């Protein structure tokens, strides 16, 4: 067991009820083009074309051979593009049940499958995009291998769904997916979980490691730092538990499995709960009739690291397993910065809120201040559990010094790994965007 | 108020007739009301703490020291005046100095039986003009630099101005105070880009300017008690002359006990005398997590070790060798610098290991300058400025060790 | 004028010794 | 003519080339030492460039530095002997920095970069020009340091000191080294404000 | 050992060559961009200064000082040419030695030797040694201590300038101008030792 | 190559050496007189003699001032080349100086030359004043002064600090003419012939034979001045010499 001490669990009101229920009927889904790092799409579809389930929609120029396939069967209704014609989303209206089928095997022979056969089926089905590399959080090249595949069987994000409930419903698919991963990896498979019991694979190279503590104990970046440190020459892959279930269903039934269980939660959700949905489901339709009145922000993913689901981005992300809804915090308070703050949450002890340990907060999207320079009062060290110097690493990101950031461990990090640093920053810096710019510069010169 | 700020907002936005004053407008509008801004990217929620509250807590943490300092400055001045003059001679002195007859005009008294109200009022007449001059002159430089570079005025000047005003003699001329704050704000802070981008403590850099440019008004036996014609040494100077037995308050004829120095019944800088008042203020900001207890712990470790070493070595000529650690704590500006000036996060080290070394260096340097430097009775300002130069070096040592661990895959 | 003659000789000899040392060092160290 | 005035502002040795800094900090406490040091550097630099260019076609490359420093040191020795004989008071104030003219980066910088590849007469002009730019900084820094630190210019009282029944309190820091760093830095800020082409890129 | 230890501490902090005598500022301000580059240059200054000062002390006492060779003959006017000549020779010899037998040392120290061949810090230290009339043992301690103090100052400046990657210096002061101000603020801190009669 | 290299080096060295040697030897005599005239001008100033031109300084110094060697231990004159004696250099040599103990070293000089040099200011053929060079450690550096004493051996005729490194506003006031004027008329010794000159902190009484006002805000430098006169008027300094002077010497 690995115990995490440094970190922060946000006590935001509206925690989901850990019971799975049927969601709203979803009439259209989409694939977000901006959520894939370094993806340059070559469109294989046009508006009005009818696509089958698991049919390729667009291909990646910078990552040859990777296919992004439709999650449902229907008709392409719109191809949203933004500044510089960047692919925002490809929206498909659900109509029909046509699909593309693949080879199916038995649970006994899954661990003995050839690696090239496994890669071929994953790439063709479009499920290869579930893997993300570390560093750079990109979809792995189809001809590359990894000695470490990390399964995120836990989630410490605020308002996150409990993985135990979902995995117990799909125990056979979860174990089958682990066997496929065991044959796929050249090294080991790290199933990172909490102390709760989970279905176990019988393969000797699949190892369960227990992580305890607050956020970010559940992030794949934390798990890699403590089990398989990553660098330029040591690349690891990560995949979440629900995608592992999809891998098991793919090799057991020969059909792409696009069902998802997402937690719908937040202060303005009337009944926070787990709802069954589909990949890329429209968040406008999913959240319909679920929210209290007023101006609210719908977030694909967690409040700490998620996409503002508005307009062409109002669809469930590829790697997101929750939907968060918050009020927009536009209120101006007279001397609000000088108030005692009985209902204000902070990592510091400058407010009366910390004196009430059992308090939950109706957090809004307010910034709680203006943008300023960094003044290191030591907040970053209280939420960073990795063996890094957070303050000096963050200054390098602000300064744009990519070479120094790499030496300080920027290659081991993702945007979500710096979400807590962004949260507790007195200067209101957004370190996720700064890190990605540094990572993009590193890849460009490599 | 809120409606007026919203209505005039368009005047200071680009294209308005008051665009060049946009920096001033945001400094005032955001002062009263929160900006009311929502997040734009990931981490859609934010911590409630911001720079304004951090700076205002430190600014409030020195209020107990400020109020006692005005009370102590008046008490020292009144006691010395009645020690020197009496009757008509005292009346002539009161009429000849505007500090004295302003106190008597506002209902106060300069007599030996003056209450705490008169003593604090007399101290106020010496401190408020200094604080007003420092605030106005320093604020002009802060606004001018922000207007030229087209940036919003970052917080932190309220802390700098009040700390600078509390570390100067009560008799400091106003024009020197204007020059001192100008050097600290412009040369030490603004040419580097403002708050969070400098390496040297701005308030102590301004005090170092006055220390070396005009040493006659910031040292000696004529500047620490605000009584005209009164010459009196302080505890650090007296101990350097004759040790513990020389601690005698000539204004009253009583020996300076340890409790007198701890409470703050001694002459010196305005806001440094009361160690108890500084402890109360420091406890609040240390508990809030604003001030670093690692730096404070390091300063105490450095002071205790080196002072004990001097006591063990001993000296038959230098009386400063036999001063214990607890006398070092309650004398001079050691407590003020340790609690509110060594803890400046921008000037200090950025690593926890570096903070311990940063604090130890300050504590060692302060005792060293007190003992083995005969020119200066105190060295807290010099110790902190010296340690600001090596604060980045401590961080470099720490990170290089961290990089070596990373290159070994943390032991794989 | 003994001081002048001594100054002229020592000035030349000091420089000559330095030049010869550098030339000898360069010939015995720098590869060719 | 332009070669004479070019190293004054466009190509200043101290403000741009970062040469000759050591003497600029030390000797600028007074105008008399700053003026004498200006003439000495200008005298040595011009003659060293002139003599080096004369023998530039015969200097062995193995001992090139030794040959150059033999000329530079010899000129400085003569300057030192003359200063002791006719300006003994100023020479005593200059202390070791009279000898440090040999190691002044301006003297060797121009001898190697220019005198080795130029005719003697242009080399003499180049040495005079760089001395003027070096002296321009020294006199400008020396003016403020002496006026604000003593109220005097060349020893002549301009601001009556309070100690002598006047009204001006001299600034002690102007007589201390840190003021020389500040004045030069702000002087560079002024030069590059009117000469934006000299601004270093970020 | 107290006399030598006192001299060593005096040459490092009390009389730091860079921030109390301000010699070698040209390389001090220029090469201080990076800590590792400054650290390499500082070691090279230590080695040259630790060798040059004792050698010039032997030359001055045996040859150049009055009544050294012939009574009544004073050759002290040859001090300037002799001191720089020795320094210029030893620095070049070290380049020929390090580049030949110790390629790792040539990368670590040899690449910085041409910069400090005629640097003011070496010549100033020799001149101060002659003025103070040190012995041979004191020359070794003074030479080593002066280099360590010089190395300490430039490395400290290098760490400050690396920290200043986050600064927002105005364009007019960017580069050389802000470096002068930085070194001036460092001089203030080192004045803490002024007045210590060690 | 080698022949050309050596020929150029030798020819260059010879030309440079001849110019350097000629300049050093030709100017040497003028160099040493400049050092002398600098100190001679200072001694004339403290003695109260007006001299402006360099020639005027030389003629007045030869006419009015006669340097003489004095042995500190015995107080008697010693025959020697007084005009060329270097007391500072003799103080640093073990064979011509004594190391002082902690009790004796009041002025913190750590050494004292065996024989010093005094300057007898003579008006014609009769000595009128004696110039005593004294030095003592200040706050920042050693401070060197000339004190002019009347033929009675007790009355100070003038004081002049000619080499000090104290702070100009605090400690550098030893060169202030107003402060120097206070020393005129003061008595060095009491009726018991003990050293009795006192630097009074906070200002000496206006009517005082031994009190001199201390430097304002410069107690440490004032202590250095007080220690300087305590040592040099004691038995280790000009004590025995001034005892013989007041008995009817000179
Ligand atoms: C705990 C704390 C201590 C501070 N101490 C000082 C100080 O001693 N002097 C000062 O000028 N500013 C001080 N500041 C304000 C500010 O952080 C400082 O001026 C930075 O150097 C601005 O870049 C302090 C701020 C905090 C939060
Ligand atoms: C305490 O925090 C602070 C402010 O508001 C709370 C300020 O307005 C300002 C701005 C002040 C002026 C004079 C523009 C500063 C500097 C500050 O530190
Ligand atoms: S002038 Fe001294 S190192 Fe260049």
Interface of E with A in 165-194 (CB under 8 A): 165-166
Q: Is the CB of B196 under 6 A from ligand 1?
A: yes
Centroid of ligand 1 to alpha carbon of B201 (angstroms): 7
Nearest 10 degrees: Cα torsion E87, E91, E93, E95: -170
Centroid of ligand 1 to alpha carbon of B202 (angstroms): 8
Nearest CB among B196, B390, B396 relative to E35 is that of B396
Cα F146 to Cα A419: distance, rounded to the nearest angstrom: 76
Could you count the other beta carbons within 10 Å of the beta carbon of residue B287?
13
Question: Cα-flanking dihedrals φ and ψ of residue F65, to 5°?
Answer: -115, 130
Tell which phi-psi region holds residue E67, choosing left (phi > 0), alpha (psi between -120 and 50) or beta: left
Q: Give the position, in ligand 1's atom list, of the atom nearest the Cα of B337.
A: 8
Cα B154 to Cα B145: distance, rounded to the nearest angstrom: 11
User: What does DSSP assign to residue A90?
Assistant: E
Do you find a cis peptide bond into A135, omega within 30 degrees of 0?
Answer: yes
Q: Give the residue whose CA is nearest to atom 12 of ligand 1.
A: B160
Give the contacts of B148 (CB within 8 A, at least 6 positions apart): none
Q: Please name the residue of chain B whose CA is at the shortest distance from the CA of residue E198.
A: B372
Q: Does C16 touch chain E (CB under 8 A)?
A: no
Q: Which residue matches tokens 């500072």?
A: F88
Neighboring chain D residues of E22 at a CB cutoff of 8 Å: 22, 25-26, 177
Question: Cα-flanking dihedrals φ and ψ of residue A134, to 5°?
Answer: -135, 120
| Yes or no, beta carbons of C19 and D66 under 8 Å apart | yes
Nearest CB among E168, E188, E194 relative to B208 is that of E188
| Yes or no, beta carbons of D173 and B212 under 8 Å apart | yes
E132-156 per-residue burial string, b: 16 or more CB within 10 A, e: under 16: eebeeebbbbbbbbbbbbbbbbbbb
Question: Cα-flanking dihedrals φ and ψ of residue E182, to 5°?
Answer: -60, -45
Cα A287 to Cα A272: distance, rounded to the nearest angstrom: 11
Give the contacts of B227 (CB within 8 A, at least 6 positions apart): B76, B77, B78, B80, B81, B84, B251
Question: Cα-flanking dihedrals φ and ψ of residue A160, to 5°?
Answer: -80, 155
Alpha helix segments (H runs only) across D10-119? 21-26, 31-54, 64-86, 88-94, 105-113
Q: How far is B240 from chain D (nearest CA, A)?
A: 25
- Best probe residue, ligand 2, of B57, B152, B157, B163 (max atoms within 8 Å of C-beta): B157
Give the contacts of E108 (CB within 8 A, at least 6 positions apart): E40, E43
Structure tokens at B196: 């969070």
What are the extents of the domains in chain B?
1-36, 59-230, 292-407
Pairing of strands F77-78, F97-99: unpaired
Interface of B with E in 119-158 (CB under 8 A): 149
**Across the B/D interface, how many CB contacts are shorter than 8 Å?**
14
Name the residue range of residue D189's domain. Answer: 1-202
Beta bridge partners of A92: A29, A76
Q: How far are the Cα atoms of B211, E14, E38 from residue B389, in angstroms, in the given order?
A: 19, 16, 15
Cα F88 to Cα F144: distance, rounded to the nearest angstrom: 11
Q: How far are the Cα atoms of A87, A128, A300, A443, B214 from residue A35, in angstroms, in the given order?
A: 10, 15, 11, 17, 62
Pairing of strands A306-308, A17-22: unpaired
Cα E95 to Cα E38: distance, rounded to the nearest angstrom: 18
The HSE-up count of residue B100 (CA atoms within 13 Å, CB side) is 19
User: What does DSSP assign to residue E14?
Assistant: I
Nearest CB among E29, E119, E170 relative to D103 is that of E119
Burial (0-12, 13-18, 19+ Cβ within 10 Å), A342: exposed
User: What does DSSP assign to residue E111?
Assistant: G
Cβ-contact D144, D83 below 8 angstroms: no
Cα B161 to Cα B133: distance, rounded to the nearest angstrom: 9
User: Closest Cα partner for B168 from B94, B61, B269?
Assistant: B269
Give the contacts of E143 (CB within 8 A, at least 6 positions apart): E49, E50, E51, E52, E53, E54, E125, E129
What are the extents of the domains in chain F?
24-250
Q: Which residue matches tokens 């949450």?
A: A345
Give the contacts of F196 (CB within 8 A, at least 6 positions apart): F187, F188, F189, F190, F210
Neighboring chain B residues of A373 at a CB cutoff of 8 Å: 154, 193-197
Q: How far is A399 from chain E (nearest CA, A)?
A: 5
Cα A9 to Cα B346: distance, rounded to the nearest angstrom: 28
Q: Largest alpha-carbon pair distance within chain D?
A: 64
Following DSSP, what letter does each residue of F15-31 receive, concatenated?
HHHHHHHHHHHHTHHHH
Q: How far are the Cα atoms of E51, E68, E112, E150 from residue E54, in angstroms, in the given order?
A: 6, 17, 21, 18
Cα A158 to Cα A306: distance, rounded to the nearest angstrom: 11
What are the extents of the domains in chain A?
2-253, 368-446
Centroid of ligand 3 to alpha carbon of D104 (angstroms): 5
What are the extents of the domains in chain E?
1-198
Neighboring chain C residues of D63 at a CB cutoff of 8 Å: 19, 22-23
User: Closest Cα partner for A151 from A104, A114, A200?
Assistant: A200
Question: Cα-flanking dihedrals φ and ψ of residue A210, to 5°?
Answer: -100, 130
Structure tokens at D156: 């002549």
Cα A25 to Cα A244: distance, rounded to the nearest angstrom: 25
Cα F236 to Cα F228: distance, rounded to the nearest angstrom: 12
Cβ-contact F197, F229 below 8 angstroms: yes
Beta bridge partners of F126: F123
Q: How far are the Cα atoms of A131, E28, E52 from residue D22, in angstroms, in the given order?
A: 61, 10, 20
Dihedral (CA of F64, F67, F70, F76) sign:
negative
The HSE-up count of residue A157 (CA atoms within 13 Å, CB side) is 32
Burial (0-12, 13-18, 19+ Cβ within 10 Å), F204: middle
Nearest CB among D22, D178, D193 relative to E120 is that of D22
Cβ-contact E76, E64 below 8 angstroms: yes
Centroid of ligand 3 to alpha carbon of E24 (angstroms): 5
Centroid of ligand 1 to alpha carbon of A376 (angstroms): 11
Dihedral (CA of D27, D30, D32, D38) sign:
positive
Q: Give the residue whose CA is nearest to atom 1 of ligand 3.
A: D20
Cα B16 to Cα D97: distance, rounded to the nearest angstrom: 58
Angle between the N-to-C axes of helices D120-150 and D2-9, in degrees from 0 to 180, rounded to the nearest 10: 40
Q: How far is D99 from chain E (nearest CA, A)?
A: 6
| Yes or no, beta carbons of E159 and B393 under 8 Å apart | yes
| Yes or no, beta carbons of C14 and E82 under 8 Å apart | yes
Cα B248 to Cα E44: distance, rounded to the nearest angstrom: 55
Could you count the other beta carbons within 10 Å of the beta carbon of residue A105?
19
CA angle E147, E152, E155 (to 5 degrees): 120
Could you count the other beta carbons within 10 Å of the beta carbon of residue A362?
14
Interface of C with D in 1-32 (CB under 8 A): 15, 18-19, 22-23, 26
Centroid of ligand 1 to alpha carbon of A192 (angstroms): 43
Burial (0-12, 13-18, 19+ Cβ within 10 Å), F194: exposed
State CA D192 to chain mean position distance.
Answer: 20
Cα A226 to Cα A412: distance, rounded to the nearest angstrom: 11
D105 in helix, strand or coil?
Answer: helix
State CA A173 to chain mean position distance.
Answer: 21
Beta bridge partners of A236: A134
Question: Cα-flanking dihedrals φ and ψ of residue B194, to 5°?
Answer: 100, -155
Cα E85 to Cα E80: distance, rounded to the nearest angstrom: 8
Q: Give the residue whose CA is nearest to atom 5 of ligand 2.
A: B31
Question: Cα-flanking dihedrals φ and ψ of residue A191, to 5°?
Answer: -90, 105
Q: Give the residue whose CA is nearest to atom 15 of ligand 2.
A: B155
The HSE-up count of residue E95 (CA atoms within 13 Å, CB side) is 15
Cα E140 to Cα A171: distance, rounded to the nearest angstrom: 77
Q: Is the CB of B161 under 6 A from ligand 1?
A: no
Could you count the other beta carbons within 10 Å of the beta carbon of residue D163?
16
Residues with CB under 6 A from ligand 2: B 27, 31, 52, 55-56, 59, 139, 142-143, 153, 155-158
Structure tokens at A179: 């066997």
- Structure's resolution in angstroms: 2.6
Cα B373 to Cα E196: distance, rounded to the nearest angstrom: 5
| Yes or no, beta carbons of F219 and B219 under 8 Å apart | no
Mutation to test the B interface, candidates E192, E194, E198, most B Cβ within 10 Å:
E192
Nearest 10 degrees: Cα torsion A362, A368, A371, A374: -90
Pairing of strands A67-69, A56-60: antiparallel
State CA A137 to chain mean position distance.
Answer: 11
Neighboring chain B residues of A326 at a CB cutoff of 8 Å: 44-45
Nearest CB among B216, B374, B375 relative to F217 is that of B216
């Amino acid at each position: 067991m690995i115990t995490i001490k440094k970190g922060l669990d946000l006590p935001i009101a509206g925690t989901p009820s850990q019971v799975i229920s049927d969601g709203k009927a979803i009439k259209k889904v989409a694939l977000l083009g901006e959520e894939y790092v370094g993806m340059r799409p070559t469109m294989h579809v046009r508006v009005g074309d009818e696509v089958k389930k698991a049919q390729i929609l667009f291909e990646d120029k910078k990552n040859p051979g990777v296919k992004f396939t439709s999650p449902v069967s229907g008709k392409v209704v719109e191809i949203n593009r933004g500044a510089k014609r960047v692919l925002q989303s490809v929206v498909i209206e659900v109509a029909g049940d046509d699909q593309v089928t693949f080879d199916k095997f038995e649970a006994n022979q899954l661990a003995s499958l050839n690696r090239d056969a496994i890669k071929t089926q994953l790439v063709e089905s479009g499920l290869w995009t579930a893997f993300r590399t570390r560093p750079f959080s990109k979809v792995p090249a189809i001809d590359s291998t990894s000695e470490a595949i990390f399964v995120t069987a836990m989630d410490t994000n605020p308002l996150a769904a409990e993985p135990t409930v979902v995995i117990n419903e799909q125990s056979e698919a979860f174990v089958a997916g682990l066997d496929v991963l065991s044959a796929l990896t050249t090294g080991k498979v790290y199933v990172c979980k909490k102390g709760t019991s989970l279905p176990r694979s019988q393969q000797p190279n699949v190892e369960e490691h227990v992580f305890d503590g607050p956020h970010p104990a559940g992030l794949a970046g934390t798990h890699m730092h403590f089990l398989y440190p990553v660098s330029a020459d040591h690349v690891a892959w990560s995949i979440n538990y629900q995608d592992v279930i999809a891998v098991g269903q793919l090799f057991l039934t020969g059909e792409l499995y696009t069902q998802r269980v997402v937690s719908l939660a937040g202060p303005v959700v009337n009944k926070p709960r787990l709802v069954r949905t589909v990949m890329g489901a429209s968040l406008e339709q999913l959240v319909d009739s679920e929210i209290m009145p007023g101006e609210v922000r719908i977030i694909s993913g967690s409040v700490l690291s998620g996409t503002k689901a508005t307009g062409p981005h109002a669809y469930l992300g590829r790697y997101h397993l929750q939907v968060s809804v918050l009020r927009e915090g536009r209120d101006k308070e007279l001397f609000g910065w000088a108030m005692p703050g009985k209902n204000k949450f902070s990592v510091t002890r400058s407010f009366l809120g910390h004196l009430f340990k059992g308090q939950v907060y109706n957090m809004t999207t307010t910034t709680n201040g203006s943008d300023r320079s960094m003044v290191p009062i030591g907040n970053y060290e209280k939420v960073m559990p990795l063996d890094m110097e957070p303050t000096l690493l963050l200054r390098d990101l602000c300064a744009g010094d990519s070479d120094s950031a790499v030496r300080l461990g920027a290659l081991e990090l993702d945007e979500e790994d710096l979400a807590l640093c962004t949260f507790v920053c007195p200067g209101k810096y957004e370190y996720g965007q700064l890190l990605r710019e540094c990572l993009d510069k590193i890849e460009k010169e490599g | 108020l809120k409606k007026f700020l919203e209505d005039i907002e368009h005047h200071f936005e680009p294209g308005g007739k008051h665009e060049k004053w946009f920096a001033l407008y945001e400094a005032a509008a955001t002062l009263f009301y929160t900006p009311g801004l929502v997040t734009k990217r990931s981490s859609h929620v934010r911590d409630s703490v911001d720079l304004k509250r951090i700076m205002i807590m430190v600014w409030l943490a020195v209020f107990p020291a400020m109020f006692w300092g005005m009370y102590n400055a008046g008490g020292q001045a009144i006691a010395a005046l009645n020690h020197l003059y009496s009757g008509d001679q005292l009346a002539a002195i009161v009429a000849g100095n505007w500090h004295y007859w302003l106190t008597e005009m506002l209902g106060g008294t300069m007599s030996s039986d003056a209450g705490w109200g008169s003593k604090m009022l007399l101290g106020a007449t010496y401190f408020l003009p200094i604080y007003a001059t420092v605030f106005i002159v320093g604020g002009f430089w802060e606004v001018l630099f922000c207007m030229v570079r087209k940036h919003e005025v970052n917080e932190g000047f309220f802390v700098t101005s009040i700390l600078f005003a509390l570390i100067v003699p009560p008799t400091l001329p106003l024009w020197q105070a204007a020059l001192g704050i100008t050097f600290g704000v412009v040369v030490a802070k603004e040419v580097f880009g403002g708050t969070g981008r400098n390496f040297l403590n701005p308030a102590l850099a301004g005090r170092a300017f006055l220390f070396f440019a005009y040493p006659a008004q910031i040292s000696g036996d004529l500047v620490w008690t605000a009584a005209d014609g009164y010459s009196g040494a302080t505890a650090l100077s007296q101990w350097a002359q004759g040790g513990a037995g020389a601690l005698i308050n000539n204004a009253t004829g009583q020996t300076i006990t340890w409790m007198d120095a701890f409470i703050g019944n001694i002459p010196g800088s305005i806001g440094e005398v009361s160690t108890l008042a500084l402890m109360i203020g420091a406890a609040f900001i240390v508990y809030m997590g604003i001030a670093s207890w690692r730096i404070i712990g390091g300063v105490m470790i450095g002071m205790i070790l080196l002072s004990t070493l001097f006591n063990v070595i001993g000296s038959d000529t230098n009386a400063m060798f036999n001063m214990p650690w607890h006398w070092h704590l309650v004398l001079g500006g050691f407590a003020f610098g340790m609690f509110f000036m060594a803890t400046d996060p921008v000037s200090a080290s950025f690593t926890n290991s570096g903070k311990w070394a940063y604090g130890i260096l300050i504590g060692v340097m302060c005792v060293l300058i007190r003992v083995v430097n005969p020119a200066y009775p105190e060295g807290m300002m010099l110790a902190i400025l010296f340690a600001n130069l090596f604060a980045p070096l401590f961080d470099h040592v720490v990170v290089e060790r961290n990089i070596k661990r990373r290159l070994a895959r943390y032991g794989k | 004028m003994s001081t002048i003659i001594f100054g002229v000789v020592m000035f030349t000899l000091i420089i000559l010794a330095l030049v010869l040392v550098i030339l000898f060092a360069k010939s015995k160290l720098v590869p060719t | 003519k332009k070669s004479v005035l070019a190293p004054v502002l466009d190509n200043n040795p101290i403000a741009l080339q970062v040469l000759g800094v050591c003497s600029a900090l030390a000797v600028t406490t007074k105008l008399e030492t700053a003026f004498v040091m200006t003439l000495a550097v200008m005298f040595v630099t011009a003659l060293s460039n002139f003599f080096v260019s004369l023998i530039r076609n015969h200097i062995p490359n193995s001992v090139r530095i030794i040959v150059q420093m033999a000329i530079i040191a010899s000129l400085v020795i003569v300057v030192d002997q003359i200063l002791k004989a006719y300006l003994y008071d100023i020479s005593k104030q200059l202390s070791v920095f009279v000898g440090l003219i040999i190691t002044n980066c301006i003297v060797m910088g121009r001898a190697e970069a220019f005198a080795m590849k130029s005719e003697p007469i242009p080399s003499f002009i180049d040495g005079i020009g760089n001395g003027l730019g070096y002296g321009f900084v020294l006199m400008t820094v020396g003016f403020f340091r002496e006026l604000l630190g003593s109220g005097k210019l060349f020893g002549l009282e301009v601001l009556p000191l309070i100690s002598n029944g006047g009204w001006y309190q001299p600034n002690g820091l102007m007589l201390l080294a840190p003021s020389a760093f500040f004045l030069i830095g702000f002087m560079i800020w002024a030069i590059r404000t009117f000469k934006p082409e000299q601004v270093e890129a970020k | 050992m107290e006399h030598y230890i006192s001299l060593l501490v005096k040459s490092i902090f009390i009389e730091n060559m860079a921030l109390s005598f301000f010699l070698g500022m040209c390389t001090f301000l220029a090469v201080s961009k990076k800590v590792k580059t400054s650290f390499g240059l500082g070691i090279a200054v230590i080695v040259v200064l630790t060798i040059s000062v004792p050698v010039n002390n032997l030359v001055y006492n045996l040859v150049l000082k009055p009544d050294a060779l012939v009574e009544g003959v004073d050759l002290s006017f040859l001090n300037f040419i002799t001191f720089i000549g020795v320094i210029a020779a030893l620095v070049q010899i070290l380049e020929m030695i390090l580049d030949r037998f110790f390629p790792p040392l040539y990368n670590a120290l040899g690449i910085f030797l041409p910069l400090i061949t005629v640097n003011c810090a070496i010549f100033g230290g020799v001149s101060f040694m002659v003025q103070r009339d040190y012995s041979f043992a004191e020359s070794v301690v003074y030479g080593f201590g002066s280099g360590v103090g010089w190395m300490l100052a430039i490395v400290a400046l290098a760490g400050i300038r690396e920290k200043m990657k986050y600064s927002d210096v105005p364009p007019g002061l960017r580069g050389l101008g802000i470096t002068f101000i930085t070194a001036g603020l460092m001089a203030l801190g080192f004045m803490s030792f002024s007045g210590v009669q060690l | 190559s080698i022949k050309k290299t050596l020929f150029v080096v030798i020819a260059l060295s010879l030309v440079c050496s001849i110019i350097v040697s000629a300049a050093a030897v030709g100017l040497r005599d003028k160099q040493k007189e400049n050092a002398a005239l600098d100190k001679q001008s200072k001694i004339l100033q403290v003695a109260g003699i007006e001299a402006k031109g360099s020639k005027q300084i030389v003629e007045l110094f030869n006419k009015s001032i006669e340097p003489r060697l004095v042995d500190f231990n015995t107080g008697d004159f010693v025959e020697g080349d007084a005009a060329n004696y270097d007391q500072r250099k003799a103080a640093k040599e073990a064979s011509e100086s004594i190391k002082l103990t902690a009790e004796q070293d009041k002025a913190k000089i750590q050494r004292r030359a065996n024989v010093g040099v005094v300057y007898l200011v003579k008006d014609g053929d009769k000595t009128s004043k004696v110039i005593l060079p004294v030095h003592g450690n200040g706050l920042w550096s050693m401070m060197y002064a000339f004190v002019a004493v009347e033929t009675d051996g007790n009355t100070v005729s003038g004081l002049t600090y000619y080499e000090q490194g104290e702070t100009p506003g605090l400690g550098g006031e030893v060169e202030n003419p107003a402060w120097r004027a206070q020393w005129v008329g003061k008595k060095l010794f009491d009726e018991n012939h003990k050293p009795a000159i006192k630097i009074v902190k906070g200002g000496a009484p206006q009517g005082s034979e031994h009190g001199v006002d201390g430097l304002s805000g410069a107690t440490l430098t004032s202590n250095g001045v007080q220690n300087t006169f305590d040592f040099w008027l004691g038995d280790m300094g000009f004590g025995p010499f001034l005892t013989k002077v007041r008995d009817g010497g000179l």
